[PDB]
Amino acid sequence: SLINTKIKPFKNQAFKNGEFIEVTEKDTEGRWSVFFFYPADFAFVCPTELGDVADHYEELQKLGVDVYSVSTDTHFTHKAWHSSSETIAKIKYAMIGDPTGALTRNFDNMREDEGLADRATFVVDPQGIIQAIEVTAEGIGRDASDLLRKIKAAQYVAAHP
Amino acid sequence: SLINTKIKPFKNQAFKNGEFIEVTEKDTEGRWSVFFFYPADFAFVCPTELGDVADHYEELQKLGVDVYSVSTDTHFTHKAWHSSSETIAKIKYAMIGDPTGALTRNFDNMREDEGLADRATFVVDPQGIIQAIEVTAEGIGRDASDLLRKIKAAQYVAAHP
Amino acid sequence: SLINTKIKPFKNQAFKNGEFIEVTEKDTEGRWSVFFFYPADFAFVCPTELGDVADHYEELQKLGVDVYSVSTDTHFTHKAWHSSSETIAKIKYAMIGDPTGALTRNFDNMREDEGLADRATFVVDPQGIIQAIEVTAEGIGRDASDLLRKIKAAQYVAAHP
Amino acid sequence: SLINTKIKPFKNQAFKNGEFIEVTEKDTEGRWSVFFFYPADFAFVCPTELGDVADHYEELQKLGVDVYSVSTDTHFTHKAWHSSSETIAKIKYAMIGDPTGALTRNFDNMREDEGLADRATFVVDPQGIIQAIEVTAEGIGRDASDLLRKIKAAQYVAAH
Amino acid sequence: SLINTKIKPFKNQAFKNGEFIEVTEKDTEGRWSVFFFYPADFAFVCPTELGDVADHYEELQKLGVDVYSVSTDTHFTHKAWHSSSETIAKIKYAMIGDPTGALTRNFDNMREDEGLADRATFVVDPQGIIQAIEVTAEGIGRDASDLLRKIKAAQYVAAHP
Amino acid sequence: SLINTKIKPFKNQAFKNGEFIEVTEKDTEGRWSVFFFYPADFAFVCPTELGDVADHYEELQKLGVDVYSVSTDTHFTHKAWHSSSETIAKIKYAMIGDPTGALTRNFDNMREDEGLADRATFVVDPQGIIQAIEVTAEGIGRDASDLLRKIKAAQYVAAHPG
Amino acid sequence: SLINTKIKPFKNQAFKNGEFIEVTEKDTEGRWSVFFFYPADFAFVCPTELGDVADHYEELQKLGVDVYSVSTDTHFTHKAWHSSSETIAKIKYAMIGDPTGALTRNFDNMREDEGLADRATFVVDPQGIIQAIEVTAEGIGRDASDLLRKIKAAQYVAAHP
Amino acid sequence: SLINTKIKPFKNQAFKNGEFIEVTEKDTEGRWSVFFFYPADFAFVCPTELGDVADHYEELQKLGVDVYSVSTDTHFTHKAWHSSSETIAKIKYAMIGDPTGALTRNFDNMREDEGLADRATFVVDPQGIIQAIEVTAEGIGRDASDLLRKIKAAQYVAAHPG
Amino acid sequence: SLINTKIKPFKNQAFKNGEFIEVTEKDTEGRWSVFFFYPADFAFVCPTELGDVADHYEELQKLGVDVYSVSTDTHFTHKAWHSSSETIAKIKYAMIGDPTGALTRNFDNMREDEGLADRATFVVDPQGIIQAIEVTAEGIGRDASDLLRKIKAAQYVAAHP
Amino acid sequence: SLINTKIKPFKNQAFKNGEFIEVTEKDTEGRWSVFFFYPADFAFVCPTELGDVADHYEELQKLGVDVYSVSTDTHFTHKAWHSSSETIAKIKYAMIGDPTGALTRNFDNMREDEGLADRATFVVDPQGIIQAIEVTAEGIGRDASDLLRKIKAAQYVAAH
Ligand SMILES: [Cl-]
Ligand SMILES: [Cl-]
Ligand SMILES: [Cl-]
Ligand SMILES: [Cl-]
Ligand SMILES: [Cl-]
Ligand SMILES: [Cl-]
Ligand SMILES: [Cl-]
Ligand SMILES: [Cl-]
Ligand SMILES: [Cl-]
Ligand SMILES: [Cl-]
Ligand SMILES: [Cl-]
Ligand SMILES: [Cl-]
Ligand SMILES: [Cl-]
Ligand SMILES: [Cl-]
């Protein structure tokens, strides 16, 4: 488990609201971060999960939490996915491309014989420390409302040691 | 992470319903299993978590899911905790002692500088494959109803590929 | 260079004329093959090159030459690219996905800090021997008509040593 | 034997008279120390041994001697044990928790396939030097009046 | 491939228009360079390729491109070749001798079991970066007019990222 | 420590009651054994420890316990000591000589910078398992009465585990 | 020196009287051999030494001695040299090409920073044993008539030990 | 052979004529030294060799030669030996104890499987350089008078080179 | 020292009474042997030592003791020395030549910075075990009479434990 | 081969008419040197080779050329040979002894399994660079007159 460790430095391209931006660990410092990994854009699997986090994106921003989705696809592919799927289209958070797999491996989350990330979610606090981890196989869905509870609880223990 | 891997062989003592028993991987074969790790008996962090799983234990048992809690304390210590805590007293599943940390290290779950296991939950299917993982920091509580939901989804995809 | 070496075994998923297929080195045996590498689907480069090769595919097939394009994108992404670009839409040869980068590293052709393949073309004869190589930087376009001339010349020396 | 070697640095949590304290090697400097290892709290073995040392404890303190019991349990388990065994209840010295086993391994005293310490007693002089060692199997009891006898001889040779 | 890497330092003798000159990497700095490798002087091969590059040479020089052919023969042998074949005779560019094979190995282009260079062409820009590579087997000819096209495209892109 | 390990093979010469014998690990099997180490014969310390054990040997022999003293002196040296010390003269157990230090190092009991064994006592049961260990610095005496208590106690647990 | 050792295996191309032949160590077995090394064909050195051995060649053949000259040039280069220099033209023994430098290194005779052989002569008996070694710097000429005296003395001691 | 090498630093306790002393390589600097090794005190082998050297000791001392006998026994055992043997009793030179074996190993003279020194004699000049070596098995006796012949010769050659 | 070790195998040429012989360790088996090392033939130092041993050789022969002198000179040189020194001429035992130093190094008796043997004597019993060793600096003479006394002692102890 | 490399430093004893001397690389600096190796003194094979060089020695001295013969024998042994043999007695150049084999190994000219140098001749210029090498087996003779031809030719090339 990477629980209670500091995230490693990284530098990736991302797509966010119709534009390309670069993201590094410096963008996460002093912020709450959710890293949301998934295997592949354009898979026949319906992206319910990515869109649920999208639905909750408003509250997450009021709690000072940024959301980053990550797959080993490129940011170009993200822009195309964002254009063709109605569910993906409502995403307003950053979609990080990790074709080198460096970000994915930082989180020990690479399926090495497929070149894809596992279905993992990491909650990271402003000092870069990982406070929560959830991983599931392709049939077990990640519940975005459960994520919010965990994030809110994490902020609480930060305030009340 | 260990997602989608086979659990490793192990041999531990446990306390269960007033008795000391031995538990091994052979006890898990052909069953659904939940491994519930926690840092320490008698911390006076209220064992809200252990008791939640206890409340749901009858329900879990009807789905054919066994539950094993695990810490690096001994089974002697578990028996004493069980006699002294009203909440722990209602645990009817096996409380595994792991003073060597072998069981804990099998799940890659040791805080090496404290000698205690992290707050991790692993769902293991009847073939020994880890299908879901949840890990939290010391302040963020694991929700047994979410565990239950994940187990049912895990059981669903097994029956309907 | 890899000139005059035998290509190595490989197994990839690919998209071809509306379907997903598996390609292995066994598919190239007894055939002439062109492996046409590029960095990324949905890239700012209008894919003129992929399309130039497309125009010549009927001529190439009459020479018994198979064409495989290759990037580290997934085959899913290929299907989407084929659907959204009028130029890509006219590709009827196999588009191989190489997310593990194994195929790309076989041809020593990976930009390791980008996780993308270089702009390289390999001509492979029916015995699996690499007979021609062209690699260019991102501004210099590969000319499919120059490719044809080389292939016919390669076929001539095979017939008349 | 670790006889005549200097103890190694360590940093552990402990229970001592209703409170949790941190203990390190720096706490032993300039002092005589007895390190009293045992396998496990709440084991069915009755802890007559830990309690005999308690009976002798004011006397030891009058000699400027600190006592530390050590097991691989946590200080949490010690506090609980302290509430439940009438015998353990009379301990007024520090009960050190060693869940990492580092303290135990410093003294070469870990049963590696059990994750528990052996039944060992070490006497350490004010310079951190080990002056006496006793180790027994689980049926053979350590006698605290003999411990006292050994400490007093050690203090004598220190003086001469 | 060596695409987009910087050429390595080198120091060789060459024959150019009736004289022996020394060439080092310092001669290529601030200039465009074509390094044109071939296996052996006086080969049964009609040196059509070397002579074709000669015909296009004036044009290449006005675009600021210097040309160096390189073989593992000595410069003495080049000089003799230049005197006996009318085709080699029309070469006005520098002919580098590489009997130690160092220049050749810098470009990773040695057939170690023959001690001869492969049929490789490298286009190198003024900062020493390799921008184009072409390699062929013994029957497939390199077309100097397509070399020019590539060079002109490379120059456009230097000026217009 | 060496607690709960099996003693290692060894082969040494010993002085025992007016004779030279060879002692091996084979001689200890099926018996209770005490290995009693000390630094040097003819030393400035009066050998009260060795004499003290001698006082208890008959008790020890009725309980089926063999005693072996060990130093890195030779068996020749033990014989001579036995003739010159009034204390040593009453020793009826085997005095093992260990000039190679192998028996001593088997018990991890060598002071390498002096080439002398440390002041250590080991109780070993019939299966060759070490059941008690005692090691002390040079000014802290080893009590033979307390040794007996440990041995009697060790035999009780062997007969009544739990 | 290599005096009194057995020559190493080799397989080289050579030019001999207008044809290309392969020479191996198997060709030297059961015969006397002279291996005559020099740095480079077409060198500014007028090849007085090579033509001198030729004048004595008919005589050498009556003694059962074969002659092999060796440079790191190719056999192609030997053929051209043989055609343009009158002195070289009278060579009727085999001219071995050693572009890999393997034969030259077998005789420990490579100038490693030039990639050329030193001026060395080795006399080899029918069992492959080196019986004489002569090496000189460029100004000092090897005298073929002294070479003959040495071969006759070597043959004498073989017959009358 | 260590012939013509410089002896290595050392530090040992020794018994010399009723007193315990320390011997180090600094005691050999500027003197002629004889290091006379033997296997064991109180051994079955008649200590004639040490006694014969003792007979020549006033003559050796007149020539500025120090004598050091060495075994892997302690210096305590030497004092004891000195009191019980009439032969050893006439030794007035230093008896060095080497229980750690470092001195014996310095002279490459240890029998490792016995933990005892071999029967070796070394002559060392005032500069620390070894000028003569003699080694024999347990039955072949060293002639103290031949030792003496050599020391005088070694002293001659030192003062009259060539 | 080498005391109580078995001599190692050796094969050397030697001069004995007008003849050249080969001595090996098989010559020493079942015999008592003296190996008498010295630094050099024809040296300023008086060969008193080889001669005093020669004076006793008849008595030594009666006791079944063979003598071998050894230096790193050749057996040729021993022959010449035997012809020039009235003293060495009396020697009837084998004079072993050791130009490789092997026999000398077998006995750890080489002055490495001089290539000469030290002044050493070894008495070896019929089982090849070294029973007595004497080594001296250059001014201190070895007394062959003492040597005989030791050999006699050695034979006695062999016969009487 | 060692052709065109600089000789390595050395320090050897030698016999030079009557007396023993020490030769080192400094005695070769600034001068032309011939190092003439052979296997062994007093060998049955007659020193025709060493004598031939002696005959040409006065011509060699006039060209500023020094001669050193070398074997793994000692200088003591060389001296004795110089008296026993009429051929050898004519020798006026330095006979170097090389018992450690260092000089010989410097010229890569040692037969390791025999401890004798091979039959090799090295011509060295005043800058210490080896300009000519000839090595032969025991039946083939080194002709002294050709050694001069090579040296004069070396010197010609040296000036031009
Ligand atoms: Cl993880
Ligand atoms: Cl994990
Ligand atoms: Cl390539
Ligand atoms: Cl990858
Ligand atoms: Cl210990
Ligand atoms: Cl542990
Ligand atoms: Cl390349
Ligand atoms: Cl121990
Ligand atoms: Cl030892
Ligand atoms: Cl050579
Ligand atoms: Cl050489
Ligand atoms: Cl090469
Ligand atoms: Cl020695
Ligand atoms: Cl020796």
User: Among all chains, which residue has been given the structure tokens 């520090």?
Assistant: D94
β-pair partners for C12: C23
Integer Cα distance of A115 and C101 in angstroms: 8
CB contact at 8 A, D147 and D121: yes
- Can you read off the two tokens belonging to residue I27? 């010559």
CA of J5 to the centre of ligand 11 (A): 10
CB contact at 8 A, A69 and A36: yes
Residue E46's CB is within 10 A of a number of other CB atoms, namely 10
β-pair partners for C89: none
Question: Own/partner pairs for C21-25, CB < 8 Å, 24+ apart?
Answer: C21/C94, C23/C68, C23/C94, C23/C96, C25/C128
F 61-100 near H (Cβ less than 8 A): 72-74, 76-77, 79-81, 84, 98-100
Helix, strand, or coil here: B126? coil
As for how many domains chain A has, the answer is 1
Integer Cα distance of C156 and C74 in angstroms: 36
Residue G12's CB is within 10 A of a number of other CB atoms, namely 21
Identify which of J29, J27, J24 has the alpha carbon closest to the alpha carbon of residue J11. Answer: J24
Please tell me the distance in Å from I54's CA to the nearest CA on chain H: 20
The three-state DSSP-derived secondary structure of B15-78 is: EECCEEEEEEHHHCCCCEEEEEECCCCCCCCCCHHHHHHHHCHHHHHHCCEEEEEEECCCHHHH
Q: Hey, which chains touch G, using 3+ CB pairs under 8 Å?
A: E, J
- Can you read off the two tokens belonging to residue G2? 């290599």
What are the CA-CA distances from residue B121 to residues A134, A140, B37, B98 (Å)? 10, 15, 6, 16
Beta strand C119-124 with E19-24 is unpaired
Tell me which residue in I77, I100, I114 faces J115 most closely, judged by beta carbons: I100
Helix, strand, or coil here: D68? strand
CB contact at 8 A, J7 and J138: no
Integer Cα distance of A146 and D152 in angstroms: 64
Beta strand G65-71 with G94-97 is parallel
CATH (domain of F75): 3.40.30.10
CA of H119 to the centre of ligand 9 (A): 17
Q: How many CA atoms lie within 13 A of J85 on its CB side?
A: 21
Inter-chain touch D76–B116, beta carbons under 8 Å = no
Q: How many CA atoms lie within 13 A of E112 on its CB side?
A: 5
Identify which of F122, F124, F101, F123 has the alpha carbon closest to the alpha carbon of residue F39. Answer: F101
List of residues 6+ apart from C97 with CB closer than 8 A = C12, C13, C14, C15, C71, C72, C73, C74, C75, C76, C77, C78
Please tell me the distance in Å from F14's CA to the nearest CA on chain D: 24
Angle at Cα J16 formed by Cα J13 and Cα J22, nearest 5°? 25
The three-state DSSP-derived secondary structure of chain G is: CCCCCECCCCEEEEEECCEEEEEEHHHCCCCEEEEEECCCCCCCCCCHHHHHHHHCHHHHHHCCEEEEEEECCCHHHHHHHHHHCHHHHCCCCEEEECCCCHHHHHCCCEECCCCEECEEEEEECCCCEEEEEEEECCCCCCCHHHHHHHHHHHHHHHHCC
Burial zone of G127 (CB within 10 Å; 0-12 exposed, 13-18 middle, 19+ buried): exposed
Q: Could you tell me if D104 lies within 8 Å of chain B, comparing CB atoms?
A: no
Burial zone of I117 (CB within 10 Å; 0-12 exposed, 13-18 middle, 19+ buried): buried
Integer Cα distance of G136 and G122 in angstroms: 12
The one catalytic residue in D45, D46, D89, D158 is: D46
Question: Own/partner pairs for I45-53, CB < 8 Å, 24+ apart?
Answer: I45/I138, I46/I87, I47/I85, I47/I87, I47/I88, I48/I87, I48/I141, I49/I119, I49/I141, I49/I142, I49/I144, I50/I87, I50/I88, I50/I91, I51/I87, I51/I88, I51/I90, I51/I91, I52/I143, I52/I144, I52/I145, I53/I93, I53/I144, I53/I147
CB contact at 8 A, I65 and I31: yes
Inter-chain touch E41–G84, beta carbons under 8 Å = no
This structure's resolution (Å) is: 2.7
β-pair partners for F122: F35, F133
Beta strand D65-71 with D94-97 is parallel
Q: Could you tell me if E146 lies within 8 Å of chain C, comparing CB atoms?
A: yes
**Element holding F53 (H helix, E strand):** helix F48-55
Integer Cα distance of A94 and A101 in angstroms: 17
Q: Is the dihedral of CA J39, J45, J46, J51 positive or negative?
A: negative
What are the CA-CA distances from residue G51 to residues G43, G64, G80, G82, G157 (Å)? 14, 19, 16, 11, 28
Q: How many CA atoms lie within 13 A of C71 on its CB side?
A: 25
Integer Cα distance of J76 and J79 in angstroms: 5
Inter-chain touch E140–C134, beta carbons under 8 Å = no
Question: Own/partner pairs for I146-149, CB < 8 Å, 24+ apart?
Answer: I146/H143, I146/H146, I147/I34, I147/I53, I147/I56, I147/I121, I147/I123, I148/I56, I148/I59, I148/I60, I149/H143
Q: Could you tell me if G45 lies within 8 Å of chain E, comparing CB atoms?
A: no
**Element holding D26 (H helix, E strand):** none
- Can you read off the two tokens belonging to residue A159? 């305030």
Q: Is the dihedral of CA B92, B97, B101, B103 positive or negative?
A: negative
Q: Which amino acid is at J103?
A: L
Best residue in E38, E74, E96 to probe G by mutation, most G CBs within 10 Å? E74
DSSP B9: P
Integer Cα distance of J65 and J22 in angstroms: 18
Buried b (16+ CB within 10 A) or exposed e, F27-62: bbeeebbbbbbbbbbbbeeebebbbbbbebbeebee
- Can you read off the two tokens belonging to residue J2? 């060692």
Integer Cα distance of F120 and F117 in angstroms: 8
- Can you read off the two tokens belonging to residue D62? 């009058």
Best residue in G45, G135, G151, G156 to probe J by mutation, most J CBs within 10 Å? G135
- Scanning C10-56, the segments in alpha helix (DSSP H) are 48-55
Integer Cα distance of I135 and G98 in angstroms: 58
Looking at the CA of H111, which ligand is closest?
9
Integer Cα distance of C25 and C35 in angstroms: 12
Residue G72's CB is within 10 A of a number of other CB atoms, namely 30
Integer Cα distance of G148 and G134 in angstroms: 13
- Can you read off the two tokens belonging to residue A93? 């958070």
Tell me which residue in F136, F141, F150 faces D140 most closely, judged by beta carbons: F150
List of residues 6+ apart from D52 with CB closer than 8 A = D143, D144, D145
Helix, strand, or coil here: I96? strand
Q: What is the phi/psi pair of residue F128, to 5°?
A: 85, 10
Q: How many CA atoms lie within 13 A of D117 on its CB side?
A: 31
Q: How many CA atoms lie within 13 A of E140 on its CB side?
A: 29
DSSP string over D69-133: EEESS-HHHHHHHHHH-TTGGG--SEEEE-TT-HHHHHTT-EETTTTEE-EEEEEE-TTSBEEEE
Integer Cα distance of B125 and B6 in angstroms: 9
Q: How many CA atoms lie within 13 A of F111 on its CB side?
A: 20
Please tell me the distance in Å from D59's CA to the nearest CA on chain B: 32
β-pair partners for B18: none
What are the CA-CA distances from residue F158 to residues D137, D139, F32, F99, F124 (Å)? 11, 9, 11, 34, 12
- Can you read off the two tokens belonging to residue H27? 């005691």
Surrounding residues of ion ligand 3, Cβ less than 5 A: C 1-2; E 1
List of residues 6+ apart from I104 with CB closer than 8 A = I37, I70, I72, I98, I110, I117
Q: Which amino acid is at J133?
A: I
Integer Cα distance of D31 and F127 in angstroms: 41
CA A26 to chain centre: 16
Q: What is the phi/psi pair of residue D87, to 5°?
A: -65, -45
List of residues 6+ apart from C159 with CB closer than 8 A = none
Residue C24's CB is within 10 A of a number of other CB atoms, namely 11
CB contact at 8 A, A84 and C80: yes
Integer Cα distance of E18 and E20 in angstroms: 7
- Scanning B88-136, the segments in alpha helix (DSSP H) are 102-106
Integer Cα distance of F89 and F84 in angstroms: 8
Identify which of B147, B159, B156 has the alpha carbon closest to the alpha carbon of residue B35. Answer: B147
Q: What is the phi/psi pair of residue C92, to 5°?
A: -115, 0
What are the CA-CA distances from residue I15 to residues H15, I98, I110, J117 (Å)? 53, 12, 21, 21
CB contact at 8 A, A92 and A54: yes
CB contact at 8 A, G65 and G34: yes
CB contact at 8 A, I83 and I114: no
Identify which of F115, F77, I136 has the alpha carbon closest to the alpha carbon of residue H103. Answer: F115
User: Among all chains, which residue has been given the structure tokens 């070790």?
Assistant: I5
**Which approach determined this entry?**
X-ray
As a residue count, chain C comes to: 161
Best residue in H75, H77, H84, H111 to probe F by mutation, most F CBs within 10 Å? H77
Buried b (16+ CB within 10 A) or exposed e, D8-23: eebebbbbbeeeeeeb
Q: Which amino acid is at I86?
A: E
**Element holding I142 (H helix, E strand):** none
User: Roughly what angle, to the nearest 10 degrees, separates helices F48-55 and F144-159?
Assistant: 50
- Can you read off the two tokens belonging to residue I105? 């190094």
CA of I88 to the centre of ligand 4 (A): 83
CB contact at 8 A, H15 and H89: no
CB contact at 8 A, H88 and H103: no
- Can you read off the two tokens belonging to residue F69? 């003293």
Helix, strand, or coil here: A42? coil
Integer Cα distance of D139 and D153 in angstroms: 27
- Can you read off the two tokens belonging to residue J155? 């010197």
Integer Cα distance of B151 and A137 in angstroms: 11
As a residue count, chain B comes to: 161
Helix, strand, or coil here: F43? coil
Q: How many CA atoms lie within 13 A of E118 on its CB side?
A: 27
Inter-chain touch J140–G154, beta carbons under 8 Å = yes
Beta strand C110-111 with C116-117 is antiparallel
Q: Hey, which chains touch D, using 3+ CB pairs under 8 Å?
A: B, F
Q: Does the annotation count G46 as an active-site position?
A: yes
Integer Cα distance of B48 and B136 in angstroms: 14
Integer Cα distance of H4 and E121 in angstroms: 69
List CB contacts (< 8 A) between B75 and chain D: none
Inter-chain touch F100–H81, beta carbons under 8 Å = no
- Scanning chain J, the segments in alpha helix (DSSP H) are 48-55, 57-62, 75-84, 86-89, 102-106, 144-159
Integer Cα distance of C77 and C100 in angstroms: 15
- Scanning chain C, the segments in alpha helix (DSSP H) are 48-55, 57-62, 75-84, 102-106, 144-159
CB contact at 8 A, G28 and G39: no
CB contact at 8 A, D106 and D10: yes
Domain that holds residue D152: 1-160
